[PDB]
Amino acid sequence: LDRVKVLVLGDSGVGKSSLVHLLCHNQVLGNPSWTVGCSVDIRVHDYKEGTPEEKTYYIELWDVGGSVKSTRAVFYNSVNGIILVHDLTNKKSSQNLYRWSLEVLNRGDYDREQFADNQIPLLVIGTKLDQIHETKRHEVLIRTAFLAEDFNAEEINLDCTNPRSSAAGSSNAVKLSRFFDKVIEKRYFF
Amino acid sequence: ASLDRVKVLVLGDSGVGKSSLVHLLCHNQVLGNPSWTVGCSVDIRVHDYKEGTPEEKTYYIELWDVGGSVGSAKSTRAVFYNSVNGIILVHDLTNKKSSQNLYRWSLEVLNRDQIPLLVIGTKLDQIHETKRHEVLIRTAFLAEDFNAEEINLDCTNPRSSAAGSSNAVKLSRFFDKVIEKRY
Numbered sequence: 001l002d003r004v005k006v007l008v009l010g011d012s013g014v015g016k017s018s019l020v021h022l023l024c025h026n027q028v029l030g031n032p033s034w035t036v037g038c039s040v041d042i043r044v045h046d047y048k049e050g051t052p053e054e055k056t057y058y059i060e061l062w063d064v065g066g067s068v069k070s071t072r073a074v075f076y077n078s079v080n081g082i083i084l085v086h087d088l089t090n091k092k093s094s095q096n097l098y099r100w101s102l103e104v105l106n107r108g109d110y111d112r113e114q115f116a117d118n119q120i121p122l123l124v125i126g127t128k129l130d131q132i133h134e135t136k137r138h139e140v141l142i143r144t145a146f147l148a149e150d151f152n153a154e155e156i157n158l159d160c161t162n163p164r165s166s167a168a169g170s171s172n173a174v175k176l177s178r179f180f181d182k183v184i185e186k187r188y189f190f
Numbered sequence: 191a192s193l194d195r196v197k198v199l200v201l202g203d204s205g206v207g208k209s210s211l212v213h214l215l216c217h218n219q220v221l222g223n224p225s226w227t228v229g230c231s232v233d234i235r236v237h238d239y240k241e242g243t244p245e246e247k248t249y250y251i252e253l254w255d256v257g258g259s260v261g262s263a264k265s266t267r268a269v270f271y272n273s274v275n276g277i278i279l280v281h282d283l284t285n286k287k288s289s290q291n292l293y294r295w296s297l298e299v300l301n302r303d304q305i306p307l308l309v310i311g312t313k314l315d316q317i318h319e320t321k322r323h324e325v326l327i328r329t330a331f332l333a334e335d336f337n338a339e340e341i342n343l344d345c346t347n348p349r350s351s352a353a354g355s356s357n358a359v360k361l362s363r364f365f366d367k368v369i370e371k372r373y
């Protein structure tokens with residue numbers, strides 16, 4: 001049906017618009033401004049690229065600009081995947097992903113079984129990796145791995161302002177493509 | 191609320207009032223703080239299809255304000271025009287050229303996808319009473335050329351789309367047709 005909706009959720013200022021621009025254009029968002037309301041960009045995605053079953057899909061990235069009233073629940077309809085974005089320099093943004101994710105999966109809590117049972121693909125992306133001093137890099141990656149595990153989610157950590165963070169063939173780009181393939185599969189080829 | 195997705199494009203020149211209109215349609219409140227819309231903005235109009243009947247069904251109607259200009263060759267935004275169930279064509283009543291460009295916007299979509307159309311003129315309040323006659327003649331031609339209902343309004347007046355108003359009846363009928371012709 002070619003239609004795919006992926007929410008991009010996280011606290012204000014964590015880098016959602018910068019990430020989406022990188023995912024959709026392989027270019028850094030040079031002039032980021034405060035996102036008002038819901039911004040949508042489209043990633044033209046080759047499903048199963050390189051295979052005889054290769055098929056192009058338009059993946060909508062819905063960049064919701066709210067904070068954890070309940071009027072943004074209307075944006076959470078018909079969701080096929082969720083990207084949960086946190087700022088690695090800002091532990092509070094990481095904590096709030098427990099609220100961001102529940103806000104969709106229900107429409108200050110953590111229920112491990114709710115995430116064992118959830119079928120909507122989840123991807124946890126930590127931004128501003130470049131700002132993490134290497135002495136503390138190890139500690140933040142351990143914390144972030146446990147975060148991905150709580151959500152039963154793949155994790156990617158990157159610098160949204162570095163085009164090599166998502167350059168073709170890179171480890172990040174492969175994980176991103178795998179996530180988008182899973183979104184498409186669970187909506188259609190299930 | 192239905193899980194079916196309903197997509198309405200909101201097209202028109204920059205600055206004609208698209209964000210103010212969308213915000214009024216989706217929130218029944220005036221956009222107090224309008225800024226230059228960067229990229230594609232989406233808001234949701236919650237619409238009760240067949241309200242009052244045993245078949246009443248709620249739809250989330252996506253209003254996609256894609257943006258851009260009809261002077262480009264850019265024009266990579268064609269992927270935003272897929273799976274369209276309706277189009278709102280917005281022009282500024284004080285700006286005749288924005289009305290002429292609606293002919294370009296419509297062709298740009300009908301080359302890059304009968305989709306229901308609604309033609310909305312903004313800034314009615316800026317129309318001097320002397321020029322009201324000329325502006326009604328012009329907008330009737332848009333309605334006829336696009337085979338569309340037409341609404342002219344002031345997006346900065348909250349009552350311009352209030353429930354029970356003639357404008358709200360036309361809007362509701364348009365959204366019914368969007369649903370009836372798709373989803």
Ligand SMILES: Nc1nc2c(ncn2[C@@H]2O[C@H](COP(=O)(O)OP(=O)(O)OP(O)(O)=S)[C@@H](O)[C@H]2O)c(=O)[nH]1
Nearest residue numbers: 012013014015016017018032034035127128159160
């Ligand atoms: N160094 C570095 N800066 C980043 C990174 N990601 C985002 N930024 C910067 O952080 C600021 C916020 O980025 P932005 O993309 O606007 O966040 P946002 O989540 O969209 O913010 P908002 O719209 O809810 S206000 C910008 O100045 C941007 O350049 C990153 O990975 N590394």
Ligand SMILES: Nc1nc2c(ncn2[C@@H]2O[C@H](COP(=O)(O)OP(=O)(O)OP(O)(O)=S)[C@@H](O)[C@H]2O)c(=O)[nH]1
Nearest residue numbers: 204205206207208209210224226227312313344345
């Ligand atoms: N008097 C009056 N002013 C209006 C009306 N509609 C919009 N405006 C004003 O016109 C200006 C532009 O409105 P806006 O809603 O931002 O247009 P836009 O098409 O979204 O502009 P852009 O995002 O492409 S830059 C705003 O100052 C707004 O308050 C109207 O019906 N009457």
Ligand SMILES: [Mg+2]
Nearest residue numbers: 016017034035
């Ligand atoms: Mg933003």
Ligand SMILES: [Mg+2]
Nearest residue numbers: 208209226227
């Ligand atoms: Mg605007």
